[PDB]
Design a protein around this ligand. Sequence first.
Ligand SMILES: *[C@](O)(C(=O)NC1CC1)[C@H](CCC)NC(=O)[C@@H]1[C@H]2CCC[C@H]2CN1C(=O)[C@@H](NC(=O)[C@@H](NC(=O)c1cnccn1)C1CCCCC1)C(C)(C)C
Ligand SMILES: [Cl-]
Ligand SMILES: [Cl-]
Lengths: 301, 300
Amino acid sequence: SGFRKMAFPSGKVEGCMVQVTCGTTTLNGLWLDDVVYCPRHVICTSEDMLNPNYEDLLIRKSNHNFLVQAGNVQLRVIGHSMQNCVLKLKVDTANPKTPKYKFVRIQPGQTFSVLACYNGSPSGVYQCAMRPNFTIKGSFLNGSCGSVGFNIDYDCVSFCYMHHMELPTGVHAGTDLEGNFYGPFVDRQTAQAAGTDTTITVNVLAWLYAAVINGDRWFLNRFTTTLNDFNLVAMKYNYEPLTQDHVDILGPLSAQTGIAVLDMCASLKELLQNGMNGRTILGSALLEDEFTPFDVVRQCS
Amino acid sequence: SGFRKMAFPSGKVEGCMVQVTCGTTTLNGLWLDDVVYCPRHVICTPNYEDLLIRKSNHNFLVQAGNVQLRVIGHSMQNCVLKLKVDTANPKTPKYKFVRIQPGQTFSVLACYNGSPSGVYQCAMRPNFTIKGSFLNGSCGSVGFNIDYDCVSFCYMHHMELPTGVHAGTDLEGNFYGPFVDRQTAQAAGTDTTITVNVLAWLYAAVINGDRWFLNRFTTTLNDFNLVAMKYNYEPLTQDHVDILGPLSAQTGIAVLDMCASLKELLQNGMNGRTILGSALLEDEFTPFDVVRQCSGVTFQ
Ligand SMILES: *[C@](O)(C(=O)NC1CC1)[C@H](CCC)NC(=O)[C@@H]1[C@H]2CCC[C@H]2CN1C(=O)[C@@H](NC(=O)[C@@H](NC(=O)c1cnccn1)C1CCCCC1)C(C)(C)C
Ligand SMILES: [Cl-]
Ligand SMILES: [Cl-]
């Protein structure tokens, strides 16, 4: 029993972390096989972060302008290339600690573990979600760029995030491991508005199912709703629309608990109307939206 | 910016986890140097001395991945089994065994069949339980802190209590709390809130720009402790005040000034507001956890 914000064990990722220095900029890189991946803005100066011409800056660099440190060992850079907003440094050594891995681009609502690192060394591991507005609510200080997000379903590491910047509201933006930003963001210091964030409805329902599995029934009611009436109400609380895909996805937790998906929707509608009235669900006084249907089945079964 | 429930990096501990099988019971062991540690209840179907006498070394199946370890010795220490093996763990980190106090936090590496499955942060509750997340097969999962490349092992998981909270031992097999490794009736005591940790988390909030709950008021240790008692909060000691000293100095909010904030929150509630995305007063971050996370301390 119990229900925690549970991260993946970080060891497979810790053995991939290195420090990358170009100029006076030091940040983290990810060493897989004979390639180090890091944010391309490691090549930028103070005098040019508004409108950097990355192609013009990179052509001016030598392999020897990149200092790559794995523990107290310098790796030899024998080549460099840019893929979207990630820099790929070819190095003379394959990482002997390279795990089984893949690169996956995730959808809003998906969860992943972050290993927050400084100077190529890990500080901590925590759980995050890709917000509907394509930010993440991370915990990152200066130096954390090149920290990664990952899942480890079944001994294979799925890299899904690389950290690049903090927005003025204190939330975070970054790329997949192909260097494509999540959301409308660019690696420039120009002003860039994050969309209004919304609550991940399918995740809140998954968590209510986790609560029932763990023996909490207080918030259930005798009512049902149509999907369309649910979405009309939930939109008024800045909840994401629930789609038929989401209803299908909740089918197995519905089967395990014997509570129909649109019956649980009616419970959520009442909780938005009433609040908790001094009660808690799985030790929270708020409706939690950073557990996916898959995360609930992983932790509860 | 940002403030998350952050665990220690788990890599040093992942390389120590093994599967222990005795008869029909499979659970987790911790492999350090040439010894595997696990709950003594692995030998059960209790008179532990007697049950153990009847076991030869080959009764204990220890697997480190798909490699069998050879057991050459077995002894009991309190409620832990120590299995001597013929090979030292070449992945043994710098470590020590420590016994923590109620209110102290640590990371749990939840494991099944000797395989790490997840990591989370929790606190030893004032009632000596932990609010963990554990299914059948999780016994022998361990809790730990890291302090500059040294792993301090503090917890080994033994059982779930009827309310769904968890009980276990230090790595010398001494239970936290008034629990026994027996199928008899046992209950979590009334729990209380870890006051010094709530104050640390309000400092984390202020560092992260969440300031609405701050007020002009200050209090006394004596006046606040009468309010703490009233709200089933642990007493705040002068040592706790001294421990929050760095956060007082960094934020400009003295501890008894923050206590007057906490009094108002206990008396009044949060009036529809949140702190660091919580509608509850969070008590599973220590002062050291807040300094750690907000200053970017790393592990070697
Ligand atoms: C990272 O590269 C790093 O760890 N570097 C090691 C120390 C040497 C670093 C992480 C900093 C917290 N990231 C950055 O420096 C990035 C790079 C890459 C893209 C832009 C630059 C600047 N930057 C930032 O994260 C900045 N963020 C911003 O400038 C945002 N704007 C504001 O925060 C802001 C605040 N008040 C008024 C006006 N603007 C913008 C917002 C829109 C998207 C782009 C970033 C700082 C300010 C350094 C956090
Ligand atoms: Cl996805
Ligand atoms: Cl969290």
